[PDB]
Symmetry: C3
Subunit: 604 residues, 3 copies
């Protein structure tokens, strides 16, 4: 009774808040301590969990304004008893349907004791049976928690209700969680996902470690799932999962949107980064109206593989994007030391993914994979894929491959070493005839660029649309036209028309060229105007060379070395000065001079 008096004095000091041991907890790894937790938690004081293994016969419910802190991971341990049945998460907020506010959890281990159920078992339904489930809550800070041997997830942030709602694409579920911080947490040995979000927003997941699920279904390190939005993940690590970071939805739910990945390291996952929207992948399916806005940077992928046979032996990826609009990837390094682990495609952008950008990519060691980067589109309006500053080190028989359905591709500054690849084919390959391409460099690929079946092995620069260079202003240029090295006032307004080295000169002539000229105009077809001033060619095949103030208006009518004449004859070459003065008549075989025609001349 002396020790009990001393303890009473210590308890009253409340150095940490109130200890659970003050309310009767033993933390001996045997005794049911649930009532002690419930009493401390309802007391209104911040609650402290000291050293021990605190056994619990039912889930710990958290009310609003809870502070629960432990002595640390693997120091304060909270654990389900062997006798606990099915249906409850180990720790969760009390108001399951409308939520709670202001919950601060730090520094302990949650052990779900999934072992007690035998092997091969996951959550019984919906969000039930995670180690930590946060439903419809606002202002939740989760820090330095280790979640171990979990039946469903390690840590799950979701909307109100025990079930996950499936309300269809383009919806938002009632009672989201909001303002959540998950930092320095670890999740392992889970049945589904390590750390996951559903139908919630304004979430930061920082410096966490999720690894080694028990099962081999859709078991992801970080799963930003159905209904999520406005989430930042940064400096996390995943290991040995299906997806490292998955961002998705099911077919009957809205995809996660506006998600930022500010650095991540994926170790030996199947698909390190896996962004998708089930049910919105097929050509005959609707486009997702929710799968939009992902910005990911400083992404690391190491030895992706499917040794464990996740998802019925799904093929490995460094990055897989499907369904999503507006994905921006900057700074990606994929590395492997075993060429047989991933043999299909290292990076894929397919299945209705659109308006995606990849910049600053290094892929090394994928020497038995068919494709480094493989993009397939749907001939959708306003689509684009931009791939720039990519370096491939023995990665991909096709380094960058662009398939069907892609009309707008920009591929710039790609370099590749192919010497160590098993049967390399081409650094860059394109199905469409009009990719935009520049800055290719390679060694050990038999072909550098293959564009719609034509090989380019000595450098390539391809640009699309109306073209203009070395010209500070101009009028209209047709998409099959150009103006170069010209001063103001020029136009090339029809298919196959162009102006070079001229001033104030215009062509509306299909199949035409004006060069070295001023104030000249071509307006027929098959027109040529060269080194001329105030020249007009206005009939089919009409042309002028070294002419001033002259108009060629005849069919196949050419004017040479002339000033101030207008000609109209068919198949005639003419010259003159204020009046026509000679003619070579190809039609009738006549030669005519205004003055004399003579032989026996000398030029001195």
């Amino acid at each position: 009774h002396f020790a009990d008096l001393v303890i009473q004095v210590i308890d009253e000091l409340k150095q940490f808040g109130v200890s659970v041991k003050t309310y009767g907890a033993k933390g001996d790894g045997v005794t049911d301590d649930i009532r002690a937790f419930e009493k401390a938690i309802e007391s209104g004081f911040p609650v402290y969990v000291p050293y021990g293994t605190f056994m619990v016969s039912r889930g710990i419910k958290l009310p609003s304004n809870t502070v629960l802190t432990g002595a640390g991971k693997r120091n304060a341990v909270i654990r389900f008893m062997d006798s606990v049945g099915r249906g409850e998460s180990l720790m969760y907020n009390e108001n399951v349907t409308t939520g709670n506010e202001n919950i601060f959890l730090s520094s302990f281990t949650l052990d779900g004791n999934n072992k007690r159920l035998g092997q091969g078992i996951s959550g019984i339904g919906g969000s039930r049976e995670s180690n930590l489930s946060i439903r419809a809550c606002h202002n939740v800070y989760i820090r330095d928690i280790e979640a171990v041997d979990c039946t469903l997830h390690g840590i799950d942030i979701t909307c109100g209700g025990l079930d996950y709602p499936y309300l269809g694409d383009g919806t938002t579920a009632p009672n989201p969680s909001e303002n959540i911080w998950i930092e320095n947490c670890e999740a392992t040995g889970f049945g589904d996902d390590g750390i996951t979000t559903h139908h919630s927003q304004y979430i930061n997941i920082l410096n966490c470690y999720s690894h080694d699920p028990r099962l081999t279904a859709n078991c992801n390190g970080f799963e930003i799932d159905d209904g999520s939005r406005h989430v930042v993940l940064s400096n996390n690590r995943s290991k040995g999962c299906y997806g490292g970071i998955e961002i998705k939805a099911h077919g009957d739910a809205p995809a996660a949107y506006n998600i930022s990945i500010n650095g991540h390291m994926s170790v030996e996952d199947v698909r390190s980064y896996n962004f998708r929207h089930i049910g919105h992948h097929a050509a005959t399916a609707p486009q997702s109206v929710s799968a939009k806005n992902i910005v990911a940077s400083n992404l690391v992928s190491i030895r992706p593989n499917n040794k464990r046979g996740f998802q019925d032996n799904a093929t490995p990826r460094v990055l897989a994007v499907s369904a999503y609009y507006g994905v921006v990837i900057n700074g990606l390094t994929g590395y492997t030391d075993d060429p047989n682990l991933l043999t299909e495609t290292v990076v894929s952008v397919q299945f209705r993914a659109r308006n995606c950008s990849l910049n600053g990519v290094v892929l090394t060691g994928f020497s038995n994979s068919e494709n480094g980067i493989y993009v397939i589109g749907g001939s959708r309006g306003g689509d684009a894929v931009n791939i720039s500053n990519v370096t491939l080190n023995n990665s991909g028989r096709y380094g960058v491959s662009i398939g069907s359905g892609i009309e707008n591709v920009s591929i710039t500054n790609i370099s590749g070493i192919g010497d160590g690849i098993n049967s390399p084919v081409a650094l860059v390959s394109t199905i469409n005839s009009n990719p935009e391409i520049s800055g290719l460099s390679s060694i050990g690929y038999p072909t550098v660029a293959r564009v719609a079946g034509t090989d380019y092995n000595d450098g390539l620069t391809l640009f699309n649309g109306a073209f203009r260079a070395s010209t500070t202003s101009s009028g209209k240029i047709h998409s099959e036209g150009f103006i170069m090295g010209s001063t103001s006032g020029c136009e090339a307004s029809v298919s196959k028309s162009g102006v070079l080295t001229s001033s104030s000169s215009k062509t509306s002539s299909e199949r035409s060229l004006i060069a070295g000229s001023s104030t000249s105009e071509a307006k027929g077809t098959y027109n040529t105007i060269l080194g001329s001033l105030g020249a007009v060619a206005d009939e089919q095949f009409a042309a002028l060379i070294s002419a001033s103030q002259s108009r060629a208006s005849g069919n196949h009518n050419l004017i040479l070395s002339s000033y101030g004449i207008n000609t109209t004859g068919s198949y005639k070459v003419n010259g003159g000065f204020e009046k026509i003065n000679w003619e070579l008549d190809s039609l009738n075989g006549r030669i005519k001079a205004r003055d004399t025609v003579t032989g026996g001349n000398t030029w001195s």
Copy 2:
């Protein structure tokens, strides 16, 4: 007296350092505990604050080499009493003017009890009345502090002195703070800013949350203000403020410089990212000499709006840059679900901002805004704006708009969906005639590119300056000139001069073209040389076609199908072989042959 004996033994154990309760603190929410804090703090031991609300009748002064740690946010709470007057911050370093060293603060709530003053009140002047003020200090670590109901700022890092110094642009204030770490802190209900820096350097602000100011002036989540430099912000969140992150100075102070934003999430702020230097915005004002170097990446902006009417109903922005030189933005996602919240410009670069770069941008939902990105310049030398890899999803009647004063613009890989926009106009619009542009893709915009009033709807590629392609080396090329498909030794050295498909061929001829030639030279004006070897055209309108070793030196003198002749006649077509052998004289209407002229011929 037994309990007091037990307590004495516990106190002597010093398990945390020394508790404030050992020095008399009650932490009961009523009793003035200031003397207990002062005694513990002056004792030389690390100081611990256990569970309680510790009331204080004056500010807590911190000397050098202080360790002050609490039981945690909302566990250890430190609070001004209702009776406290004006002028003091709740917690600050003792040496206000020359500073202190080595201060380590962790795990407690600071409650400024601004309520006690009535509503609508902010700091009485300068840096006075923040929850935490650090002045002229070196080596300060601030961790897991919650700052609540603050009169001025939540956390303020500043130079020595109670007042903020206003020494003019280009200055550095004496006694900066240096080496500061602010991590996992929260600031809310403040009068000015949540977390702010002044006249200080070498600062990391990490994983903090600043939200919901009391007032509606320049009330920012994170304000990197007057005199700041060498600051990193990473993985912070701001919500419901004027600026999410503001980087600035007032007119009579140096702007913050060399600031890095390594990821941020802004939720429902007015201007999520707002970089400016007051007094250095107008065309007739001086350029800031201090506003330089901002690198920002992985920036998230959500539902920017001005529902609260901050700053006299300032218009919302995802990003606003003014005054600053050298701003690099990479990976920006702006998202809204309410088109009426922001109706002017989503991203603006204006008011003397220069040498700015935006890459990897996704803007979605801004379907009633006039401009997606709007850039205005000042025709300043060495200026540039680079915009690349941008995707717009129903954001901006003008997607990317370039206004006046901009001579150097690069706009590449821009795509836009305009179908859901209220009256869309153009994906890209340019006032200047010479933007550099490529890779535009759109649906639902009536015009794709409008360049100085001319529409391009079928693809566009525009480049500036001297142009060269498919040519590995050359001599000089004029800015209104080009060389293409040529081997070494070519030049096109004057306005409107160009060489195609040639070797060792040079033109200094204004309005000229050399093609398909070798060792040829044009040096008059209006010169054409085609399919020739060793040809020279050296007079106005002189030309040669299919000629070898020949020189055309006459006015409008054309040589055809010839070898080894030099001609000088005006308005003459000539041919020959070592000597001139025929002539078509346009001037006088004469035709001359050296040998015979005959009719009645056949060609067999």
Copy 3:
């Protein structure tokens, strides 16, 4: 004996785990507490270190499954006694050769008491004598540790064994450490490095501060050394070191590979970011087979200098890359306010570095440095250097300089202010004749671009390889060829061949041009075809203008204004319609008509 009874009750409560004071530790700064630490650590309980300076006469050995936590930095202090000899780290895992698992260290100061040895002393050999040495361990979390006055390193993660292994390039040492987290740690006053990794993998180093080594050799803030791989550093700061972050190996070891830097701030280091592989730098040395894959972003460098004379007065750098393949840098800001601190090169890519990319760079104040960015290559196959979106503010007499051995360079969107530079030369300078360049803007540089000795001051756009614009598909284009403004079916298959404004027209003619034509073909040399339909030029210097269904097969044979003729004469101009009808014979000086030749004509 009453106080001892109370203490016994407290000890039994185990509020933190077990305190070292329970096992006899005094923490008085004098008494040897090693046996108390050893007893607590072997007890199986988590171990707590309360307030005190705990002196230790030998290193603290950590077994597997250790939890050791203190009252905090500068609160719980662990220190070597003055009498301790040489050879031991202060704290290390017990199994030096095969390693330990599951070690969790938090919240204390390690004071190595290097002072006790006199000044100028470092580790006696290999990994011996760091404050904290982790050898061959799995699952180690190191948090909130301050490492002070260290003999060797502050914190060292290494493989098994006391010595560092030197097994040669391309090897992997046995018994790596794996899964290591180092967060919020500080290292200072060390003999070698602050925080370093060797022969280990899956490591995150976050929010740490390494500064001010005692010595002036290879003394780095963060050194990712020999054998390291799969490491993320983020939001760390280094100050006053040789390298801020060094990534390297020695000559007889494999370089660190697949390293991510997700933001860093370097303050007054010599080489802020220094990536190298000793022994693999010289032209006559082997290429490193291990130095691959570095992705670094949001890098800050401030006032780099060598005031302390590190490494025999090595010259300062913002960034130095050598030996490494596949380095991607995005978002770099270098800033200085003292132009005399760094006078050679701000950023260097040299000494066998290859396939490197720099994007989004701002360098300001380096106004007495010779080079802003200086790249040297080795004429290696598949090499590339990409430099884009760079802004220089009075930094570098040569802003961007490309030296010898570089065949593939892309330099885009570079702008520079040179007005405040001491004798500026050129914004961009290139030794090679064929750099790819666009988007240059400058003020205050006397030359904008100098390309192999030729100056371009008015804008430049240079592209390499086969060129095509405003043409949606084509057949083959030679690398010294082009097709522009054309529709399908065109080819330009040989050197110096090109097609403009045409349809289904092909040239295999060296030095040729087809323009404004359809179904035409050039297959000789020196061929010109203009404004023609179904025209063939198949002999040297043959040409056709305004011709339909005609073939020019003569030497220097030109056809004009014709239909349906085939000509074969040498030095002849011909025209006709189904048959040849006139000829101008340059060879013999004859003029021939099929019908009449007449003078005295008029054209009305």
